[PDB]
Amino acid sequence: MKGLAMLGIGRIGWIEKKIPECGPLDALVRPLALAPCTSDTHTVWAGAIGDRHDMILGHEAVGQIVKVGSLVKRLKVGDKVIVPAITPDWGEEESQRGYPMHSGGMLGGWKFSNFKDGVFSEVFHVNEADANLALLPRDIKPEDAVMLSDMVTTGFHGAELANIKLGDTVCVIGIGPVGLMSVAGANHLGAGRIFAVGSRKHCCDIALEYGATDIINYKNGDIVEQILKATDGKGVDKVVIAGGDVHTFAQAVKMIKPGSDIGNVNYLGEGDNIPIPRSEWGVGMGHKHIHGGLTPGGRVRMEKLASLISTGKLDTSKLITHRFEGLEKVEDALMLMKNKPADLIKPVVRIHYDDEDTLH
Amino acid sequence: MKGLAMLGIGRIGWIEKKIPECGPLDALVRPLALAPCTSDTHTVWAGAIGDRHDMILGHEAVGQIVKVGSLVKRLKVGDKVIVPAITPDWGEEESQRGYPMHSGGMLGGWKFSNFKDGVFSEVFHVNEADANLALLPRDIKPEDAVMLSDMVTTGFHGAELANIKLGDTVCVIGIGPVGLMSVAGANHLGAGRIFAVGSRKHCCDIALEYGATDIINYKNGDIVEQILKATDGKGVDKVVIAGGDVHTFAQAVKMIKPGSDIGNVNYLGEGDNIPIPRSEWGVGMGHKHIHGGLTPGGRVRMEKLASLISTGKLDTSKLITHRFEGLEKVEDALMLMKNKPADLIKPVVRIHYDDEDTLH
Amino acid sequence: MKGLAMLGIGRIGWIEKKIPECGPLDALVRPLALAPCTSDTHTVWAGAIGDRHDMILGHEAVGQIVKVGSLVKRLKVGDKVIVPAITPDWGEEESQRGYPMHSGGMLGGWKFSNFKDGVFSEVFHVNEADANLALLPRDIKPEDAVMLSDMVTTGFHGAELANIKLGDTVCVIGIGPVGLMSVAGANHLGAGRIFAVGSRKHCCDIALEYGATDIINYKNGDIVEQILKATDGKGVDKVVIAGGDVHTFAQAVKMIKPGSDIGNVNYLGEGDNIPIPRSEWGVGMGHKHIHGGLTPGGRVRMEKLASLISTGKLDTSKLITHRFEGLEKVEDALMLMKNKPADLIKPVVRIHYDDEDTLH
Amino acid sequence: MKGLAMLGIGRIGWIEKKIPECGPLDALVRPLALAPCTSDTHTVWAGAIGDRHDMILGHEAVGQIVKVGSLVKRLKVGDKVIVPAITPDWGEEESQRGYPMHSGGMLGGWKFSNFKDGVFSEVFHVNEADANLALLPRDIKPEDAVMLSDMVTTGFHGAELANIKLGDTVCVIGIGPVGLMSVAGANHLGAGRIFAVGSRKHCCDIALEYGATDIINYKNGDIVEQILKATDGKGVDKVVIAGGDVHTFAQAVKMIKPGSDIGNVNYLGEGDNIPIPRSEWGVGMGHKHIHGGLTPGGRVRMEKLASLISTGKLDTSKLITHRFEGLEKVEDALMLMKNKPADLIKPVVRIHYDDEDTLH
Ligand SMILES: C[As](C)(=O)[O-]
Ligand SMILES: C[As](C)(=O)[O-]
Ligand SMILES: C[As](C)(=O)[O-]
Ligand SMILES: C[As](C)(=O)[O-]
Ligand SMILES: [Cl-]
Ligand SMILES: [Zn+2]
Ligand SMILES: [Zn+2]
Ligand SMILES: [Zn+2]
Ligand SMILES: [Zn+2]
């Protein structure tokens, strides 16, 4: 089979691999809808998580089951599924202690395009398929559902980590597709005033559609100073970090009240250390709690989030700026995430099969 | 000064009381908008919290400061304020351990029309005024803000106590004004499917406007059966109880999943015991957590909830069914909470003064 | 193979069952030390969880692996293990949402002697063995370790559900082996004054050894009145219920402060309803949170608790009052739990094999 | 009245100040036992929280009431009290949202020797005295109770912020008196294996007495390496930081598991930034939560912690290494904190009055 792989730091290409073996608890899946992610960009071109050799990329898919292991009970060949980017080993120590996204070791639940061949191939492998795949509800378009795999769940996790409470004033730093979902997540957790820090017109517009109330554009001056002026020197209640670099944490600390939470979901591609400013962190004692977490995954997470789409309470189609057709277009789609044109949020690639509606 | 008082069980009337003494941390307040509460109907006609002698009624007000004590620093004569129903003693033991609504003893933070003269008088007294009074934002009508004092905060507290998470399926039992605000609160905590259990059409339909997705009317059969059928026997993730009686808890237990939360905010006015069904409660072990709590109060609670109105994220005007003018009409309004017509959610009474805009 | 079974409500006896099938993730285990539980007396003689036929009893074992499935990675034939009473299906919906003891439905993680053949047989079956079996540390006696399976974990879980904080005054109601472990759990969560409500003399004496400070014996008068007198009317901070009947909940609510937690781990064997007193529960609003939960299980829970024994911080030997040798003696041991002589806390049965130290 | 003050960065001496004005909620207190703190050495000699003008030092006292305001209800002249280092304004915003130690702004609840005249004077002032002073239990020596003000509460807060669970393996970094209390705090939250990092022999032995199981001395190699050995490369579950410098955080991040908590209570006296290592922090995604908090204070905190002494479950006497008599000797005692001999944990100064037992 064919897949789009990381050949080495700074190098991608199409390669052939064997179809993966399906064990008793596994499923093999063919992609129906795919999206590329900024994270693969860091992994490939920054080498942020080490070198790789012929690792198939991608971790956002809606798919169709082509094979199930003998112990699979919830799924059958032909079923259409939402594939979460994080597919935990549910019995591992870290899962038993409440952190299934770190199953088997830090980031161990994030398999696809971390250290396991990802979803950009004709067939891919899902471990613990019953636990890790949600059936696609009939009222959700595949292109909308592929936003659940990573964008919705990560952006919402940023808001969860920021411990957002009813009526909180919140700042979301970085308004790419993950940040726009942190704006939506903060709004869904009861935030009132929401500052969205970004400068791309189309991203800023979308942030307002998801519940942002204030756009903070760095071209109008230091963003911390803008936030402080807007809040009469008091700062914000909670901060979500969904973009930027290691220096964004100092900005979050400087703009946030004491007794508060900073929720990072940004994958940090470079820099030895994240500098936390001593004085503004209350010289160690300001209760400015700092969180940085990988998204949850698995089927329950997908089902809960899908229910917001099905009930008309979450519209993920706003994230989709480019629509492609055919597996080969994932290469174009991924390059868009590297190049970042002004009109871009997320591309989606749709793939059709001759037996998509009869496969069993 | 005149106030509408409970003169004993089943008896109300206007009485004259001295203007209360204003100590260093206190303020005296005149009403601008007032609303009656079903709780005062329980108190007066059912004797649900014991007999009272000459206690002024009412605990939902927007007001205007007429006097402040010597140590008050945030308020001045003439300021317009949102008065919360619950006005804690912030340094008491219960406050120090995170339960300020029970300051000084169970329900101790609920003073007005519990054991302290309430807001239905020409002037009323607020303890710890800097802590307990929020300024009325210039963009909120007094009639809309009076819903913050008790309806919005209590309804939202039901949703907080039910521990609602992103994508949860929720049932709210009881759809009077508190129940409607529990639906709104559940929706603002990220609920997906929300079942609202009530029968009167103008309440049921307003629930849909606040985020309900399913209306359950007991006239179509047992509401537990209806909810189970709707969820294919799985039940709902979380339940808020915002009305009914002691037997509503058994319904909540029978319709909810194991590993769940039941958040009650209903004031139970009769019955020796609340029966919890042993078998459906997992014979003691189903992790169906049962919570029953008095609303939070004080200035911060009001300020946070008000910000949801100011940002256009909450409309409380839909709760108001009747609009009266003049302090005397609190008597007519309270009598409506007692006679319970089809027309009714909440009356509000507006009171005007010659120097309403010039007092200083 | 021989096992001791519930043949019907009120009837037990030895039966023959086929050696269980061992699937890819499973292990087959032979018992090395076993203990009987009060729960099995409720199940058999009270019919508290419905009728059963031919169900092997028991859910407390230290055992030795005799067979592992083809995908078992952490365990080998011959390994000595602590078997938790609760052996979850870690990928089921409930596990993914943080309640693995309810995997598959309420109480679903409690398999042994609930709806699956338990540990009182020559060989028994463990699902998801890598996830559910802890290796027996070399410095823990099998008889001390068997107290981890259910007594320590359930007792500690009562303390966890009671949300015990540093310096809290706590009451544990019911001082059988589980309650004694709730005393020990409360002490290990930082409780200061601990009241232990019991009347079997030896249980009372042992409670003082595990960190109780005040034995409350009903023969001295109403236990609620005693605790209210001892706390000059203010009540206790938190309450664990580890014994008694449905009416024990009313005692907990009457002795506890508002803004507090009642953690129940008692398996309730009869009564249609648990009555919660309306007035003392703050007429629905006292924030007296009521929790009732099945113990955690799996290997992580066992490993954590076992580390308290290995570090010299928990002595479970004080629980053992009766010692037997030979598999047949589990019948004698279970009959003690039914009859409850004054002498009794917990019996243990030791089983030996010729190749106990050589099996591989 | 005489007091020992910071006269400027690097300078201390005795000055005369006016006996403070006692408002309606205030009390004036004379010292009976006093202790110096490392924090005052950072403040005076490192200028870690800015320059100060004539600020009386000290924030650890057992005292006796000499004057109470007209609205004080729990205290009378002559009463002996435990004075917490932190004395919140309980009605401020931060207190209302659960962070009373930040009342009025970051570190605002820490008044004594932060920005308010401290306890090293003949008389000092306590705001909100009913809320902020605990009566000294008759069974606790003044020298032992003075350890509650700051050492016990801050150390225990370190363990609280580190979110320690039953059976967790914990590392406490820094074993001065606050660190010894973090060890005790961890043991009182149910930790099993506890690693105490320090090299001073007397401190190391005392750590073993408070529940440490392993002592990690840096002279035997990089402490991160030592801890990873002893945990078979998996790391510890939780880390408390109770000493060191800004570089200690990187050590904590490197020794801890993903899905974990680092609880800092150390007052960081120098360095622009705290570097968090990007890779070992899971490239922003490891769920290694970082907390840094000022101790709780007020009466309830002191009463709960004092109950641990009164019940025989905490011995603070082991912290006292030097004993002085007479108010003058607080200068000598603070100088020991600055020069730190091998001999030292905490000095205490006892102050006697002719009417100590007769004042009313
Ligand atoms: C939000 As991700 C799975 O690209 O680190
Ligand atoms: C303050 As109320 C019990 O009427 O919501
Ligand atoms: C496993 As049990 C209900 O006997 O503690
Ligand atoms: C009150 As302190 C910062 O010396 O622990
Ligand atoms: Cl002090
Ligand atoms: Zn991604
Ligand atoms: Zn009311
Ligand atoms: Zn049992
Ligand atoms: Zn100090």
Reduce the DSSP state of residue B230 to 3 states and report it. Answer: helix
As for ligand 2, residues whose beta carbon falls within 6 Å of it are B 37, 39, 59, 85, 110, 150, 154, 267, 295
Put simply, the answer to whether A24 touches C128 (Cβ < 8 Å) is: no
Domain ranges of chain B: 1-161+293-360, 162-292
Cβ of D154 closer than 6 Å to ligand 4, yes or no, is yes
The count of other CB atoms within 10 Å of the CB of residue B18 is: 7
Instruction: State both tokens at A312.
Output: 């008309």
Give the closest residue to B107 by CA, choosing from B122, B92, B124: B92
Residue with tokens 């603002």, as numbered in its chain: B188
Amino acid at B354: D
Give the closest residue to B85 by CA, choosing from C285, A165, A168, D300: C285
Half-sphere exposure of B12 (CA within 13 A, CB side): 24
Q: Which residues contact D290 (CB under 8 A, 6 or more apart)?
A: A276, A289, A290, A291, D249, D253, D262, D264, D276
Q: Looking at the complex, does the CB of residue B160 fall below 8 Å from at least one CB of chain D?
A: no
Q: Give the number of the ligand closest to the Cα of residue B157.
A: 2
From the list D24, D92, D131, the residue facing B96 with the nearest CB is D131
Put simply, the answer to whether C311 touches D213 (Cβ < 8 Å) is: yes
| Gaps in chain B after residue (C–N beyond 2.5 Å) | none
CB environment D113-139: b (16+ within 10 A), e (fewer): bbebbbbbbebbbbbbbbbbbbbbeee
Q: Looking at the complex, does the CB of residue C208 fall below 8 Å from at least one CB of chain D?
A: no
Q: Which residues contact D44 (CB under 8 A, 6 or more apart)?
A: D6, D9, D10, D11, D12, D57
Task: Give the helix, strand, coil percentages of chain D, each rounded to 5.
Answer: 30, 25, 45
Rounded Cα distance between B58 and B42, Å, is 12
Neighbors of chain D with 3 or more C-beta pairs under 8 Å: A, B, C
Q: Which residues contact A50 (CB under 8 A, 6 or more apart)?
A: none
Answer whether D316's CB lies under 8 Å from D128's CB: no
Reduce the DSSP state of residue D16 to 3 states and report it. Answer: strand
Q: What is the least distance, in Å, from the CA of C196 to any CA of chain D?
A: 15
Reduce the DSSP state of residue C277 to 3 states and report it. Answer: strand
Give the closest residue to A260 by CA, choosing from D291, C114, D56, B136: D291
Half-sphere exposure of A232 (CA within 13 A, CB side): 0
C-beta pairs of B332-337 under 8 Å, 24+ apart in sequence: B333/B34, B333/B35, B333/B36, B334/B4, B334/B12, B334/B36, B334/B40, B334/B41, B334/B57, B334/B58, B334/B120, B336/B36, B337/B36, B337/B37, B337/B38, B337/B40, B337/B41
Rounded-to-10 torsion of CA C1, C7, C12, C13: -30
Answer whether B117's CB lies under 8 Å from B55's CB: yes
Amino acid at C240: V
Q: C117: left (phi > 0), else alpha (psi -120 to 50), else beta?
A: beta
Put simply, the answer to whether D304 touches C167 (Cβ < 8 Å) is: yes
Rounded Cα distance between C168 and C186, Å, is 9
Radius of gyration of chain B from Cα atoms?
A: 20
Distance (angstroms) between ligand 5 centre and the Cα of D4 equals 14
Q: Which residues contact B334 (CB under 8 A, 6 or more apart)?
A: B4, B12, B36, B40, B41, B57, B58, B120
Beta bridge partners of C13: C5
Rounded Cα distance between C317 and C152, Å, is 11
Give the closest residue to B267 by CA, choosing from B239, B242, B301: B242
From the list A96, A131, A301, the residue facing C131 with the nearest CB is A96
Reduce the DSSP state of residue B197 to 3 states and report it. Answer: strand
How remote is the C-alpha of B86 from its chain's centroid? 9
Answer whether D96's CB lies under 8 Å from D102's CB: no
The count of other CB atoms within 10 Å of the CB of residue B302 is: 26
Q: Give the number of the ligand closest to the Cα of residue D84.
A: 5
**What angle is formed at CA A249 by the lines to CA A244 and CA A251, rounded to 5 degrees?**
90
Rounded Cα distance between B63 and C156, Å, is 51
Rounded Cα distance between A63 and A135, Å, is 10
Answer whether C149's CB lies under 8 Å from C60's CB: yes
Rounded Cα distance between D262 and D241, Å, is 7
Resolution of the coordinates in A? 1.8
Q: What is the least distance, in Å, from the CA of D89 to any CA of chain B?
A: 8
Rounded Cα distance between A156 and A308, Å, is 12
Contacts of A278 in chain D (CB under 8 A): 246, 268, 270-274
Radius of gyration of chain A from Cα atoms?
A: 20
From the list A193, A304, A308, the residue facing B307 with the nearest CB is A193
Answer whether A311's CB lies under 8 Å from A303's CB: no
Reduce the DSSP state of residue D37 to 3 states and report it. Answer: coil
Widest Cα–Cα separation across chain C: 64
Residue whose CB lies within 8 A of the most ligand 2 atoms, among B34, B38, B39, for a mutation test: B39
The count of other CB atoms within 10 Å of the CB of residue D50 is: 10
Instruction: State both tokens at D88.
Output: 């919140």
Give one DSSP letter per residue of B97-134, joined into a string: TT-GGGTTSTTTT--BTTTB--SSBSSEEESSHHHH-E
Put simply, the answer to whether C308 touches D166 (Cβ < 8 Å) is: yes
Residue with tokens 């306590």, as numbered in its chain: D126
Half-sphere exposure of C140 (CA within 13 A, CB side): 30
Reduce the DSSP state of residue A117 to 3 states and report it. Answer: coil
Searching chain C, which residue's CA lies closest to the CA of residue A98? C98
Give the closest residue to A190 by CA, choosing from B313, D97, C317: B313
Instruction: State both tokens at D319.
Output: 């912290």
Question: Where do the H-state alpha helices sit in chain C?
Answer: 38-41, 93-96, 129-132, 142-145, 151-161, 177-188, 201-209, 223-230, 248-255, 298-310, 329-339
The count of other CB atoms within 10 Å of the CB of residue A74 is: 16
Contacts of D211 in chain C (CB under 8 A): 313
Answer whether A179's CB lies under 8 Å from A155's CB: yes
Distance (angstroms) between ligand 6 centre and the Cα of D228 equals 31
Q: Looking at the complex, does the CB of residue D160 fall below 8 Å from at least one CB of chain B?
A: no
Amino acid at A343: D
Contacts of C263 in chain D (CB under 8 A): none
Answer whether C224's CB lies under 8 Å from C200's CB: no
Beta bridge partners of D61: D34, D83
Rounded-to-10 torsion of CA B213, B217, B220, B221: 110
HEC-encoded secondary structure of D178-210: HHHHHHHHHHCCCCCCEEEECCCHHHHHHHHHC
Contacts of D308 in chain C (CB under 8 A): 166-167, 190, 192
Radius of gyration of chain C from Cα atoms?
A: 20
Half-sphere exposure of C192 (CA within 13 A, CB side): 20
Widest Cα–Cα separation across chain A: 64
Rounded Cα distance between B27 and B120, Å, is 16
**Which DSSP symbol is given to D150?**
I
Q: How many residues does chain A have?
A: 360
Q: Looking at the complex, does the CB of residue D282 fall below 8 Å from at least one CB of chain A?
A: yes
Rounded Cα distance between A127 and A103, Å, is 12
Half-sphere exposure of B63 (CA within 13 A, CB side): 34
Give the closest residue to A170 by CA, choosing from A150, A184, A151: A184
What strands lie across the sheet with A2-8, from one edge to the other? Answer: A11-16, A2-8, A55-56
Q: A161: left (phi > 0), else alpha (psi -120 to 50), else beta?
A: alpha
The count of other CB atoms within 10 Å of the CB of residue A251 is: 22
Put simply, the answer to whether D250 touches A267 (Cβ < 8 Å) is: no
Q: Which residues contact C70 (CB under 8 A, 6 or more apart)?
A: C24
Answer whether B58's CB lies under 8 Å from B330's CB: yes
Put simply, the answer to whether B166 touches A156 (Cβ < 8 Å) is: yes
Instruction: State both tokens at C193.
Output: 């004054």
Query: What is the number of helices (H) and of strands (E) in chain A?
Result: 11, 17
Cβ of D114 closer than 6 Å to ligand 4, yes or no, is no
- The CATH topology of domain C1-161+293-360 is Quinone Oxidoreductase; Chain A, domain 1 (3.90.180)
Question: Where do the H-state alpha helices sit in chain D?
Answer: 38-41, 93-96, 129-132, 142-145, 153-161, 177-187, 201-209, 223-230, 248-255, 299-310, 330-339
Answer whether A197's CB lies under 8 Å from A224's CB: no
Residue with tokens 């008000």, as numbered in its chain: B306
Give one DSSP letter per residue of D323-347, joined into a string: EEESGGGHHHHHHHHHH--TT-SEE
Put simply, the answer to whether B304 touches A192 (Cβ < 8 Å) is: yes
Torsion sign (Cα): B163, B169, B175, B181? positive
Give yes or no on whether C1-161+293-360 and C162-292 have one common fold. no
Instruction: State both tokens at B243.
Output: 């009305």
Give the closest residue to C335 by CA, choosing from C119, C49, C111, C12: C12
Rounded Cα distance between C290 and C263, Å, is 7
Rounded Cα distance between A153 and A304, Å, is 10
Instruction: State both tokens at D112.
Output: 């004594």
Q: Which numeric CATH code is attached to B162-292?
A: 3.40.50.720
Query: B204: annotated binding-site residue?
Result: no
Answer whether C226's CB lies under 8 Å from C220's CB: yes
**Which DSSP symbol is given to D120?**
S
